[PDB]
Amino acid sequence: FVIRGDEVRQIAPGQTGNIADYNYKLPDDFTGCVIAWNSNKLDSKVSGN
């Protein structure tokens, strides 16, 4: 998924936010990994996407 901008820091046990609690919520006992990377060179439109 792609929530928005650079808000990928919100996917963490304890951190709360707008999209971190209304779209994708992570539990406090989450035992896993988290990967994230930008796509400014793959998903980019001359007039916006």
| Residues present in the chain in total | 49
**Closest CB to other proteins among residues 31, 45:** 45
State how far the Cα of 44 lies from the Cα of 49, in Å rounded to an integer. 7
State how far the Cα of 7 lies from the Cα of 24, in Å rounded to an integer. 12
- Residue 43 within binding range of other proteins, rule CB under 8 A: yes
**Total site size for other proteins, rule CB under 8 A:** 10
Q: State in angstroms the smallest separation of the CB of 25 from other proteins.
A: 13
- Residue 17 within binding range of other proteins, rule CB under 8 A: yes
CA distances from 48 to 17, 18, 33 (A): 25, 23, 31
Binding site for other proteins (CB under 8 A): 1, 16-18, 43, 45-49
